[model samples]
Target chain A: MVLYFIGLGLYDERDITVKGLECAKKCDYVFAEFYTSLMAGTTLGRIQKLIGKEIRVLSREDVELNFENIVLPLAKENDVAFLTPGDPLVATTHAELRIRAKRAGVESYVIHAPSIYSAVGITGLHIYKFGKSATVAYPEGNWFPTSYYDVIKENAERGLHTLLFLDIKAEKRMYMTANEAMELLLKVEDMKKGGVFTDDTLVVVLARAGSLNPTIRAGYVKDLIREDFGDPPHILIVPGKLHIVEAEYLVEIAGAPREILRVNV
Target chain B: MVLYFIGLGLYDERDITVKGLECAKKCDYVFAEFYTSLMAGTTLGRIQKLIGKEIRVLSREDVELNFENIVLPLAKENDVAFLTPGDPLVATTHAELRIRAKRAGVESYVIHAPSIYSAVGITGLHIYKFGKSATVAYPEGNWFPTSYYDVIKENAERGLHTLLFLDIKAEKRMYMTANEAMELLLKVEDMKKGGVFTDDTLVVVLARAGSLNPTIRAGYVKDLIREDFGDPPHILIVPGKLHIVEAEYLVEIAGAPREILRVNV
Candidate 1:
C-alpha cells in the first residue's frame, strides 16, 4: 500500500541511483512520464532493462488530470513506482501527488536523483548565485511571452545569474534548441528594448548534461546564436557579473571568449 | 589518462548512480574526500566494497593543499576517480580543481548525482521560486555571521524562498541541526532588529534527504524550534509567500500547522 516517486536522473538509464533502481525493482507496478522535460539520453527499453520491469507510460493528462483515478488505485494495494526524468519533486506540480496518494490511503515517498537545476553547476557558475529561473516558451499565435526576458533583467539587476529552461514537447518530439531560445530572446529585446538580451550578450549552453561528453559552450549571442550545441535537451544560462574564477572556468572549460575574463566581471 | 569526479548521492552507498559505480570499477585508482559536507550515511569500507576498489581517503588538507602534488601526478598515467558526497562541482571550491586538472594535462569528467539543493523540492516548495542561497555559519570567536539572515530578507522581498544551509564540520563530526539554525536566526534577528526571523516564522526542515525516511517537517519556529528532526545532514529552508498548492502540500505532506493555509500567503 505504498507509492514511490523515483527519479531517473539526467541523460541515461544508468543515471538512476542504485537506491532508485532497487526501489523500482521492488515495486509491483512501474509507471513513467517523459513529457515534463527532454530526456534525450535513453530509451524506454534501456530503462526497462535497468530496472527489470515492464513500464507503463503516462501522458500529461493522465498525470495532471487523472493521477488519482488511475495510478493511486493500483497503489492502494500494490507497491507502485512512478518514474520521471530528473528529480521528480523538482517538478512543482508533482508535489501534490503525495497528497493524492495520502487521500487514496496510500503512503508516498520521494527518491532523489540528479536534476538539471543542480546539474547546471557543471557550467562552472556558482549554484548559489543562480537567482530566479524561467522557461523560454515557444510562442504561438498572438500571445508572445517576454517574461523570461524581464527575469533575466531582474536577476542581472541583482548581479545574479538567471537559469532559462528551453521548452520541450515530448509528444511532438520538438525540443527547443539554445539557438532558438536566443533568437526568441532577441525578438523580445526588440519589442521591450530593455537591452537584456542583445547580440553581444554573453550566454552559456549546457546540453545533454548527464552524458559524459555533454557540450559546454560560452560566448556572445552574436557568435553562438546559430552555433550547434549537439542534440536535444538544452539549458541556457545568462550570467550577471562573474568572479574571476567563474570567468576562468568559462574560458578554460566551457570555451568562452578571452574577452569575458576582462569584460564580464 | 583520464580523471573522474563522481558523487556518492546523499545517505548511503546505494545512493551512488549505477553509472558512477561502473565507472569507478573501471578506474585503475579511486580517491575520495569527505570534509566538505557531513556524509553521515555510509562508511568508506561499504563504498569501497560497492565499487570493488581500495579507496584512498584524503583529508581536507590533502585535497586542498596537495591535490595537484598527490592526485594529479598519478592521474597523468592512471584512470583515477575522485568520489565525493553529492555532485562534486556543486561545491564552489571544487570547481577550480577542474582548472587544476587542465593545468596538469589530465582530462576530467564529472558524473552527476543528487544534491540537497534540488532535493529541497520534497518540501513542496517550487524550485524555481527559490532565490539566492546562503549558509548559516556558526559564529566563531567575535565574528557574528548574519549574512545568511540578510539573504532571507532579500529573497523574501522578492517573493522568493530562501534555502539556508546549516554549518557542518566533517573533521570534527559536528553537524548543526535545524534547531541550531533556527536558534541562530532568532539571535541574529534580535541583534539586527530586522524582525525578519521570529518565533512565528515558518520554517521547513529536511534531514538526511536521500534516506528513505528522512524527516520532513514544517511549522512555525515557536512550535518546531526544539522538535526532534532526527539525524544529521539537515537542510533548513525559510519560505517566502506561499502558493495555495504549496500550502496544501505543506499542510498535508509536511504536517505543517493548519493556520499556515490562511496566514502564510
Candidate 2:
C-alpha cells in the first residue's frame, strides 16, 4: 500500500540514514537503480548485507519504462522501497514516479540522504552562491550538447558558482572525468567562441565527495586540465567572484594557488 | 588527534546516518551546537541517549568566537565530534572551521548527512533548477534587508528557482515562519518596487521538511500568505518558469493550483 523512495547518500551503504535503513528493512520488497548515479565506494553486496534483504536492482530502461508495471504492482500489496544514489529526486526523474504512484492509488514517501548537491559544501564553497546546475555529457555520434557550458556562463555573469555534474554511463561503466569535462568545455569554447571557458578560468574539482579523504582542488584550468582527481563521479565548480573568506578557505584547505585569493576575489 | 563534523540530518535523532552515529560513539568528547540550526523534532536528551554520550551544547557566540579555543583544544589529543543539524557546512561558517583545524595542526573530517538544501527535492521542484539561495531575516530596528528580494529577481530573470531560508533566533526560541517570510517579502517588494515578489507571485512552502507527514503547499502568495504550513523552520521557494513535468508534480503533489500547469509550465 506504500512505496518509499530512499536515497543511499553519497559514496557508500553506511551513508544511508537510520530512518532510511529502518524503512527499507520494514518493506516487503526493496528495489534500487544505480544507473542514474552509482555509489562508487561500495558494492550492492555490502548494502544488501547491511539491510539484511535481497535487493532487486533495476536498470535505467527498466525503471524508466517498466517501473509502473513492475514496482507499482508490488507496492499495491506490499510495503515496497525504491533506493537510489544521493537524494532520489535531485538529479533524476524519480519525482515523476511519485505521480504515477498517486495515479495508482499508492502512497509514496521520500526518505532523503546526503547528496553531492550539499556535499560540495566540504569544498569550503558557500552553497548559497551556487546557481542553476548542469551536467557535462559525452558527445555521441554527430550530436554535442553545449547547454551546460551556457549555464556556467549565465551563472558566472551573475557572480554565482556553477555546479557541473560529470556524466556517468552505468551500463558501459564509463564515468566522465573532470579532465574530460574540461576538454569538452574547451572544445565547446572553440565552437561558440563565448570566452566563457578557457585555460585561465578558475575551477574547483571535488572527487569522491562523501569519502573521508576525498580530493578537493581549486586552481585555474591550465594547471589542472591534465591533473588527475583520482576517481569517477567527479564534480566541477566554476566559482564566480569569491568572497575574501571563501578565497581564504580555498587557498588554505584546497591547496589552491595563493594568487587565486587575490585574482578570483 | 581528529575533529569530526557530523550532521544530524533534517528533523530528528533517528535522521542521523549510521556512520555518523558510529563516529560519534567512538569520539572521546561530543560537542553540539543548535544555534546553527535546530533539530525541532527531538530533544538533546533523546540525541544523547541514542549516541550513549553526554553531549555539551555550545551557543552561537561560543562557536563563532571561540570554537578554536574550546573545541579545537580537545581535538588535539582526542577524537572529538562536533554535531550540527543538517549538513554542517551547507549554509554556515563551519567550513572555515576546517581551516582553523589545519592552523592548529589538527586533522578534520566531515561526515555528510541530509541537508534542507537538498531535502527540498521532496517538494518535487527539479533540484538543479534552484539558483542562489537567500535567507529572509526579521527587519530589525531600522535595518530592513531587501537583498533577498533582489536574489529572487536575479534568479527569476534566468528562469532559475530561488531557495529562501526563513530566519531564526535560537536564543530567543523564535523561529520565523513561512508566513512571516512572505509578509517580509511583500514589504520589500513595496519598498524596492522590484515586482520580484508580489501577492500574485507563485511560491511553494515546505514545512517540517524531514518529517514523514510534512506539509508541502504551492499557490499564489495572495492565497497562501495566511495558510498555515503546520510548524516552524519553514522554507519558501519562488519558482521561475517551470518545466511541464515540474508544474505537473507541484499541481498533483503540492496542492498547487492546476492553472500553474499551464502558466508556469
Candidate 3:
C-alpha cells in the first residue's frame, strides 16, 4: 500500500493539481491537516464535492495523539492521501508523517501544490525582502499578543518585508478578520512604545489572497487597523525601507498617503 | 479598460485559473512578465497554445525602462492581462507595474493563483515559524556574497526557517541550482565562523518544486553541495532547530542521513 502526501494549492477548490485531485479520488482513506493557513473561499465540503470524495480532517491533537490508530492502521491496508492545504512540505507535520510511514514500511509519495511564498512576487516586494513571518492569533476576548512586533522590528532593521498570516480554526470555522489583526497590531504597538510600529509605519494588507476579489492596501499601520478592508484569509505586510519602485507602488497602486511614503533620501 | 495581473501559478501551462484563462482570452493585449519565475517543463508557446491566446512577452526593460511606452500605452487603450508564472506578487516588478497602472488612472485587479509560500505549510514546520526570506544570487565564480548568510544567521538565531529562493534570470531561462547554493552556504560558514553552520548544518534541497518529478532531500550542507540533485530551478533551505516533527520529516520523508538528522536533537 502507498501513502500520498498531497498539498492542496492555496485558496479555492480549483487550485488543486490534476494529480492531487486524482489521488484524492483514488485513495481509500483521505485525511486533511488544516491547522495551518486555510481554504476559506473553498470549504471542506466544497472540496469534497468537487473531488467526489469524503475527507476526514486530522487536527493537531488527532495526528499527534493517535497516529497509529488513524494513519498506520489505514495505510497498512490501502492507499491513504494525507492532504495539507497548500504544499505539504511547507509545514513540518507532513514531513513527520512521512517519517512515521517510512518506519512502518509504508511507501509514500508527495504530490506538490501551490502556496504563499510564491505569492510575494505579486506584491511588488522582492521575494528576498520578506523577513520572519508571524500570524495574528485570534484576539482572545479582545486581547492580542505582542509577539509579532519582534519579528517585524528585526525585519525592518534589515530592510525586509514581514508576511503576516491570520489564524483560522477550520473545525470551528473561525477565521481572524483583517480588521481584528490590525487592531492587535495597534495593541502590540502600544505595548512596544512608539518605535517599531508607529501610526506612520507603512503596512500592506492583502485580503482574499487567492480569490477573484483580492484587495490590497498600503498605508499607515493604524489606518489599516481602522479601515474596513473586508473578509478572511487576510495577510498583513509590514514593509521595511521601501525600494524606490515599491514606494511609488504604495502611493500609486495601494493608495498609501504620500506623506508616509516619502522618506529621507 | 481594466488591467488584470494574473498569476500563472507554478509549473506547466495548465496551472492558470480558468478565470485567468478567460480574462487573457478577452483582453485586447495579453502579456506576461517573464523575468521573475519561469515555467520549467513548459515553454511560452506551449502555455499560449493551452490558453488559446496570442501572448506577448514583456521584459524587465520593457516594464521598467519603457513603462510609459509599453505598459501605459496598453493600459490607456484596452483591457490587458499581465500573466506571470507562480503568484504575481512573488516578483517585485509586477507589483511596481500595478502601482503604475493605478497612477495612470487605469482600473486594476489582481487574480490570485497558487504560489510557493502557501506550499510551506506542507513541510510541517509551523506556518508561523518562517522569518524574513532572502534569495541567493549566484556569486560570480564561487566568490559568495555575505548578504545571504546574514539572513540565514538571523533566521537561525530566532529558530525560524529561512525560505531561500534561488535566483532565476527567466528570459535566458537560467536558474541557480541548489548544489551551487549549498556551496555558497559552505563558504559563508567558513567566512563567519559563527558556529551557526558547518558541514553538518541541516539543509533541504527542493528540486523541481511543483513539478511531476519533484525531489526533496534533507542533508548536511556540504554533502548536498557535492551531490547532483537532478534538474534545475531548485532551492536550498538551511532550517533552524527543527521542531520534533520537522526533524522527523527530514529523517523519514526527505531521507536525510541519520547521523545528521538526529544530531542536535
Instruction: Give the alpha-carbon lDDT of every model.
Output: 0.91, 0.92, 0.73
lDDT of 2 by residue, A93-135 (tens): 9999999999999999999999999999998889999999999
Per-model TM-score on C-alpha atoms = 0.98, 0.99, 0.84
DockQ per candidate, 2 decimals:
0.87, 0.87, 0.51
Docking class of 1: high
Candidate 3 on A123-148: residue-level lDDT in tens? 56676667677767766675656787
Q: Candidate 2 chain B — worst ten consecutive residues by lDDT sum?
A: B88-97
Error of 2 at A62 (Å): 1.0
DockQ result, candidate 3: 0.51
Candidate 1 pairs with clashing backbones: none
> After TM-score superposition, what is the CA distance of residue B238 in candidate 2 from its true location, in Å?
0.4
What docking grade applies to model 3?
A: medium
**Per-residue accuracy of model 2 over B22-120 as CA lDDT, tens digit each:** 999999999999887789889999999999999999998888999999999999999999999999788558888999899999999999999999999
| Model 2 CAPRI rating | high
The residue pairs that clash in candidate 2, if any, are none
